[PDB]
Ligand binder design. Structure first.
Ligand SMILES: Nc1ncnc2c1ncn2[C@@H]1O[C@H](COP(=O)(O)OP(=O)(O)O)[C@@H](O)[C@H]1O
Ligand SMILES: Nc1ncnc2c1ncn2[C@@H]1O[C@H](COP(=O)(O)OP(=O)(O)O)[C@@H](O)[C@H]1O
Ligand SMILES: [Mg+2]
Ligand SMILES: [Mg+2]
Lengths: 46, 528, 521
């Protein structure tokens, strides 16, 4: 039911598979480009 | 007598033990989780893994050796698979993600045999007999072409396939010419070896990925001592020096006594004549550029400038011996030994400048026959340079193997389909409870084609069946999996080449690890 | 009561329950190494408190890795170290034998038998069994060079058949025999160069006829000197060839600047005097325990001469008895009789490492083993398995007497003791008879590890011996019994003589103990 009955990794180490890794890498990158977008162009803010 | 729980082992109540079959099933399940992570990172259409260092660092890689190295595991069997791949990279350099897939698939096939009442030593005995049939069959279909300087092209096509998997594929034609041209230069042809200390790999971030080039000299990250020295020269005789430019000082506990005024005035005169004596000795011999390991002085810096004689300060240890081999000069420990026959020769010594930073680098080229070359990697990302360095090391290690052994086989799955038929055909004449172990070997050997097809997007059992049916009917052992969708399953036409000793090790080394695991039955470890 | 004799915490036990609880404590030690016996034995995995795994099939190292604290069980761990110090093989055969001598006499202790009667019976049986082995030990007349090579190949092949390297026992048994005839009289164990190099295959291990040691630290210019010589002259030295102070306890007091410059030239002339003396002697390869500076490295690069430094002591001594030089602490005397010589010297690459080779020594009296595996524990188990065939052959030269194995010699002894017990009357029948029934534990474990019927086979062995087949053991490939002497399963007679004496002394000691006292802290 869990991530394989045996324990391979240590305590505190995490792993992400295909369906959830693409979720982290895609929300992490969009967050960076959203904070910065407001400072683009002749009339960008500060 | 009331045999109360008497104490036998220290900390007996905090220790655990597995025995019998349940301990053997835990090994297989632990080696099935590790080998299924590396399945996706196989072949030209594979995908790579994100790795986060313990402190704060990020690594992106496709190599099988480094992935299992930076992954921290706690299972003991999982630590055996890490060492299985590490022992492959240093011996060959290519195939380190192919061994753990085969070993993991070799253990899974033995799970059904154990459940039927089969002794594990009997399985580990039948496996070795099969590995002697596959290796003896691999020499029969091996083809050796040639290796020299004048016709280089099969060597290029060998390094083209290994680079096909890594991220460096946009420019992988250019990076296949650097790897081949930088090996036959530094490699001897009588002793048949390669000195990797003679090849320097230096990467500098910023720029473009296709700007990577091969330099036929030495590039050192330093600059001239005085800001008013000429940046380039056209005919320089390199004067390699080890000793500094300071006045001499003995190592024993010297003490110099000054008991008068004339002894004091004779000491100022001593210091200033020693500086002028040094520049006279360098200029007399005809030297044009000075290279020093230790630092200069405030006074010895102008004398070099005033005499039109540029110099480089504080260069490293290993870099000095590369300039000596490249330029053809010799290293002198004093000024008295500096003669005209101990000088190098460069054709051009420039000082390249990067963008809006203060990073200056000294380059040395246009030399005669050399035994030292450097690789200059460029790129616009931190993770691109590190992965580019790893991919180039794999390309160099493939060519080094071809010098020892010319003969090659054809990849893309062709070697595995052919090897799995020889084992299965010979297993039909072995009636001693070994046909089961031999048949299990030939079934785990076909996981490599079923990993390339699944990654490509095709059906494994539908494509793999059609390839064996075509190979038996014809007499062509060079048919593989069309991963790149080119139309022809013939690997000879598609120019897919694999070194023979690379494939031999992936079978001989992978079998022996399975013998340890099948031999281990008890575990005794503390509890947490 | 208000004043008490011993401290508060002195645990004490005595009586019949004290002794029976000791027999049941040796049943746990014997069961920890029960399944590592025979060609189909399985090794164990032990972990320390730090996390280092030690994977092995030999009794001696398994019992060393358990933190046994039971005073009675600690006798069985001490006799194992005795066996691996005298003969080196048979370690796990004295652990089952020691526990089987206590299990068979456990019921007699409960019935109220005086344990002194048991000790007299155990000592009488051991002397009657050790003398039977020497009576029927096979020897040969005029052991010629050919027949004295076949004898040690068979013995070394049998000690290897139960280990990790069991498929390649033929290839390895040829290297061990050749590695011991190079030694001369004392057969020192420090004259064999066990080296471990990661990567490769088990069939790529080589035996060299000289010395081989790893490349040490080198300074600038090391890549500018040749790495292949035809007939060099090895100069084994013990000197620091580097620019330093003459003596740590020294001081220089100069007065004028003219004497200042002469001092600086004096240190550069002392060093250059030593290097010139080496170069004039005709030497081509130089070695030194003490470090070699970079000035000396570039001196030898301009004269096509190889240099090395910081060589371990264990490697220079192995060179001396392979080339024929001597360690020189001074360069004032370098004659022709203090230099070495060989036929080839080069520096190849094996497994991403640089190694120096000194092959080609017709008067060599030492060898070196290069082991090629695929993991750190693959090489340690291969080195421990090679350490058993070394000591078996070493013991087999001083004693050219062999007996058959696979239970063939345990069963002949149990037949002789059963016949002897039926003549003497009294309570000695049930004690000697209990000694003969405990010697068949070795054949029983061979059929239990392979998965055979341990009872039907033993009924056949007991019938073949009472008819009168002396060397009829067991067979694991044929599912039956066979002649183990004609099947070339041989072992020296010294591995069973010392196994009975050690097992009988450990059993006789535990029985005599009456009570135990444990003091606090
Ligand atoms: N162009 C190609 N077509 C078909 N198969 C290929 C091609 N290039 C590489 N391969 C296969 O990919 C397999 C894995 O190689 P790779 O993914 O580079 O990692 P490694 O070489 O470390 O195992 C090899 O067995 C090889 O046969
Ligand atoms: N070819 C063979 N057939 C049957 N039994 C054998 C054969 N070779 C060795 N044996 C048995 O296997 C045993 C080896 O045990 P081993 O694990 O070496 O114990 P130790 O390590 O203490 O010497 C010997 O007692 C011997 O009787
Ligand atoms: Mg590859
Ligand atoms: Mg043994």
């Amino acid at each position: 039911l869990s991530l394989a009955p045996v324990n391979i990794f240590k305590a505190g180490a995490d792993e992400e598979r295909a369906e959830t890794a693409r979720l982290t890498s895609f929300i992490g990158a969009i967050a960076i480009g959203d904070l910065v977008k407001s400072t683009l162009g002749p009339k960008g803010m500060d | 007598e009331y045999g109360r729980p008497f104490l036998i082992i220290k900390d007996q109540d905090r220790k655990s033990r597995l025995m019998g079959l349940e301990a053997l099933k835990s090994h297989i399940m632990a080696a099935k989780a590790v080998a299924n992570t590396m399945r996706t990172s196989l072949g030209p259409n594979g995908l790579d893994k994100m790795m986060v260092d313990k402190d704060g660092d990020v690594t992106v890689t496709n190599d099988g050796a480094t992935i299992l190295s930076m992954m921290d595991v706690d299972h003991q069997i999982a630590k055996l698979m890490v060492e299985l791949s590490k022992s492959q990279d240093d011996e060959i350099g290519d195939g380190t993600t192919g061994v753990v897939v085969l070993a993991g698939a070799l253990l899974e096939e033995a799970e059904q045999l154990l459940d039927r009442g089969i002794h594990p030593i009997r399985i580990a005995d039948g496996y070795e007999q099969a590995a002697r049939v596959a290796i003896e069959h691999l020499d029969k279909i091996s083809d050796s072409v040639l290796v020299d300087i004048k016709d280089t092209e099969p060597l290029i096509q060998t390094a083209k396939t290994t680079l096909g998997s890594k991220v460096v594929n946009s420019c992988h034609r250019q990076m296949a010419e650097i790897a081949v041209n930088a090996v036959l230069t530094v490699a001897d042809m009588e002793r048949r070896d390669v000195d990797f200390e003679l090849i320097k790999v230096e990467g500098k971030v910023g720029g473009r990925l296709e700007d990577t080039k091969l330099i036929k000299g030495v590039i050192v990250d330093k600059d001239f001592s005085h800001p008013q020295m000429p940046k380039k020269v056209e005919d320089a005789k390199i004067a390699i020096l080890t000793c500094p430019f300071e006045p001499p000082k003995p190592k024993t506990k010297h003490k110099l006594d000054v008991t008068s005024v004339e002894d004091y005035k004779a000491l100022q005169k001593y210091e200033k004549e020693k500086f002028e004596e040094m520049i006279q000795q360098i200029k007399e011999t005809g030297a044009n550029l000075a290279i020093c390991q230790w630092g200069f002085d405030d006074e010895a810096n102008h004398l070099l400038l005033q005499n039109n004689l540029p110099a480089v300060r504080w260069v490293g240890g290993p870099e000095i011996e590369l300039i000596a081999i490249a330029t053809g000069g010799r290293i002198v420990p004093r000024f008295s030994e500096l003669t005209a026959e101990k000088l190098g020769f460069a054709g051009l010594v420039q000082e390249i400048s990067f963008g809006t930073t203060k990073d200056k680098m000294l380059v040395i080229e246009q030399c005669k026959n050399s035994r030292a070359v450097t690789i200059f990697i460029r790129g616009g990302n931190k993770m691109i340079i590190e992965e580019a360095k790893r991919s180039l090391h794999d390309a160099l290690c493939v060519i080094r193997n071809l010098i020892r052994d010319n003969r090659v086989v054809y990849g893309g799955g062709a070697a595995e389909i052919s090897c799995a038929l020889a084992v299965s055909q010979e297993a039909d004449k072995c009636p001693t409870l070994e046909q089961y172990a031999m048949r299990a070997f030939a079934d785990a050997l076909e996981v490599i084609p079923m990993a390339l097809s699944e990654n490509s997007g095709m059906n494994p059992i539908q494509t793999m069946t059609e390839v064996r049916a075509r190979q038996v009917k014809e007499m062509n052992p060079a048919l593989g999996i069309d991963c790149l969708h080119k139309g022809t399953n013939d690997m000879k036409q598609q120019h897919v080449i694999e070194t023979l000793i690379g494939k031999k090790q992936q079978i001989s080394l992978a079998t022996q690890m399975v013998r340890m695991i099948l031999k281990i039955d008890d575990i005794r470890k503390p509890g947490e | 009561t208000p004043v008490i004799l011993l401290k508060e915490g002195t645990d004490s036990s005595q009586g019949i329950p004290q002794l029976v609880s000791n027999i049941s404590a040796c049943q746990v030690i014997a069961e920890a190494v029960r399944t590592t016996l025979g060609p189909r034995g399985m090794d164990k995995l032990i972990v320390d408190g730090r996390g280092k795994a030690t994977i092995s099939n030999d009794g001696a190292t398994i019992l060393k890795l358990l933190d046994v604290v039971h005073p009675a069980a600690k006798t069985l761990v001490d006799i194992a170290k005795s066996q691996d110090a005298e003969v080196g093989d048979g370690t796990t055969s004295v652990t089952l034998l020691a526990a089987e001598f206590l299990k068979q006499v456990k019921p007699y202790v409960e019935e109220g038998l005086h344990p002194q009667i048991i000790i007299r019976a155990f000592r009488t049986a051991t002397q009657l069994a050790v003398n039977k082995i020497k009576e029927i030990a096979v020897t040969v007349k005029k052991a010629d060079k050919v027949e004295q090579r076949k004898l040690l190949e068979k013995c070394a092949m049998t000690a290897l058949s139960s280990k990790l390297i069991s498929q390649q026992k033929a290839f390895f048994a040829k290297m061990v025999v050749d590695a011991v005839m190079m030694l001369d009289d004392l057969l020192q164990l420090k004259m064999i160069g066990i080296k471990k190099v990661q990567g490769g295959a088990l069939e790529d291990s080589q035996l060299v006829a000289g010395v081989a040691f790893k490349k040490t630290f080198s300074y600038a210019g090391f890549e500018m000197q040749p790495k292949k010589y035809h007939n060099p002259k090895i100069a084994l030295l013990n000197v620091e060839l580097e620019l330093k102070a003459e003596k740590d306890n020294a001081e220089i007091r100069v007065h004028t600047v003219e004497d200042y410059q002469a001092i600086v030239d004096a240190e550069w002339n002392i060093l250059y005097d030593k290097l010139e003396k080496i170069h004039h002697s005709g030497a081509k390869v130089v070695l030194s325990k003490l470090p070699i500076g970079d000035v000396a490295t570039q001196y030898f690069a301009d004269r096509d001469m190889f240099c090395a430094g910081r060589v371990p002591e264990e490697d220079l001594k192995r060179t001396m008895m392979a080339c024929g030089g001597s360690i020189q602490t001074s360069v004032n005397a370098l004659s022709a009789d203090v230099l070495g010589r060989c036929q080839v010297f080069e520096e190849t690459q094996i497994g991403g490492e640089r190694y120096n080779f000194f092959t080609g020594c017709p008067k060599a009296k030492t060898c070196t083993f290069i082991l090629r595996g695929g993991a750190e524990q693959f090489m340690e188990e291969t080195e421990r398995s090679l350490h058993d065939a070394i000591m078996i052959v070493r013991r087999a030269i001083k004693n050219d007497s062999v007996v058959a194995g696979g239970g063939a010699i345990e069963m002949e002894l149990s037949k002789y003791l059963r016949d002897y017990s039926r003549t003497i009357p009294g309570k000695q029948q049930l004690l000697i008879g209990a000694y003969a029934k405990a010697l068949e534990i070795i054949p029983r474990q061979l059929c239990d590890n392979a998965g055979f019927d341990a009872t039907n086979i033993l009924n056949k062995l007991r019938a073949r011996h009472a008819q009168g087949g002396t060397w009829y053991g067991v067979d694991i490939n044929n599912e039956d019994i066979a002649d183990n002497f004609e099947a070339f399963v041989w072992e020296p007679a010294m591995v069973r003589i010392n196994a009975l004496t050690a097992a009988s002394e450990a059993a006789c000691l535990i029985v005599s103990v009456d009570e135990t006292i444990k003091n606090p802290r």
